[PDB]
Design a protein around this ligand. Structure first.
Ligand code: X84
Length: 294
């Protein structure tokens, strides 16, 4: 690196390889993502650059956008662990409710900020939620999906996770709204509670049908306009809705109520991040210290 010294390979993101690196001058430790293919669109450059101004305590700071040697690198603030790893580490005992609540509350504040600035994530997942020893959790990769357009894959033929995708995306809607992020966060909230993914689909249709089997096959009553969606088929099986008491036991009624509002089929009926912050579920929210082993 011209100014960095790769510490280690953090992993293989959806856009490219990511390294933990140290700025040789400032000495700061950061996450360096090499972006994937042969030109680097200027449209993307301007858009990404805009994200450098999107600063909030629950949003991973984009420190720099480096377009040199016709290559694109994104420099982000570094956090030591992601929520997917934390959940696996907490699988035996489960993340305590107070911490689940603190994290959900912080993530909603982050979404409320991004959404008020007209920035969507579009691909939220546990691996994109980073945590530190102080009890903070931050959203990573906000705005990259729109700026870089179609995702497709990573760069090493890795399989795209569909588990957190909103039904309107699965049904072929071409215009995303802030609601897609609320849906993904609801799926993550449920996973923290039960310690099992809510809708672990292994294909686009399996993803959609897992959603239908749990929440009921949507119709014009609960989702006006659904039968006119691009990929909707009248031949979809019609499953009856299950009770939330069976979907996220043993979450209390405040929790089930909030989750039900984050998983409404109609994106327009889905609760906003701002409104969710006011839900009675957060009446007793606090900020616990997580047991993090680094
Ligand atoms: N900004 C960051 O700090 C960061 C960035 C990305 N990324 O993709 O830009 C990332 N990839 C998620 C892959 C998980 O291995 C993980 C990060 N930190 C959490 C972490 C740090 C060290 C080891 N395991 C997890």
């Amino acid at each position: 690196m011209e100014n960095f010294q790769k510490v280690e390979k953090i992993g293989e993101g959806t856009y490219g390889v990511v390294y933990k690196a140290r700025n040789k001058l400032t000495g700061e430790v950061v996450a360096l993502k090499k972006i994937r293919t042969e030109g680097v669109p200027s449209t993307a450059i301007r858009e990404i650059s805009l994200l450098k101004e999107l600063n909030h305590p629950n949003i991973v700071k984009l420190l720099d956008v480096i377009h040199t040697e016709n290559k694109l690198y994104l420099v982000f603030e570094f956090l030591h662990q992601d929520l997917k790893k934390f959940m696996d580490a907490s699988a035996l005992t489960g993340i305590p409710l107070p911490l689940i609540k603190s994290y959900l509350f912080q993530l909603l504040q982050g979404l409320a900020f991004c959404h008020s600035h007209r920035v969507l994530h579009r691909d939220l997942k546990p691996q994109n939620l980073l945590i530190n020893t102080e009890g903070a959790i931050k959203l990573a990769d906000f705005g990259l999906a729109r700026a870089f357009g179609v995702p497709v894959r990573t760069y090493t033929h890795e399989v795209v996770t569909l588990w957190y995708r909103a039904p309107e995306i699965l049904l072929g809607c071409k215009y995303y709204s802030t609601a897609v992020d609320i849906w993904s966060l609801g799926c993550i909230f449920a996973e923290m509670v039960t310690r099992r993914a809510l809708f672990p689909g292994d294909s686009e249709i399996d993803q959609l049908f897992r959603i239908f089997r749990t929440l009921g096959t949507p119709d014009e009553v609960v989702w006006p306009g659904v039968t006119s969606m691009p990929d909707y088929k009248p031949s979809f099986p019609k499953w009856a809705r299950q009770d939330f008491s069976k979907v996220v036991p043993p979450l209390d009624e405040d929790g089930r109520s909030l989750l039900s509002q984050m998983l409404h089929y109609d994106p327009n009926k889905r609760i906003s991040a701002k409104a969710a912050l006011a839900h009675p579920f957060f009446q007793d929210v606090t900020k616990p210290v997580p047991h993090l082993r680094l």
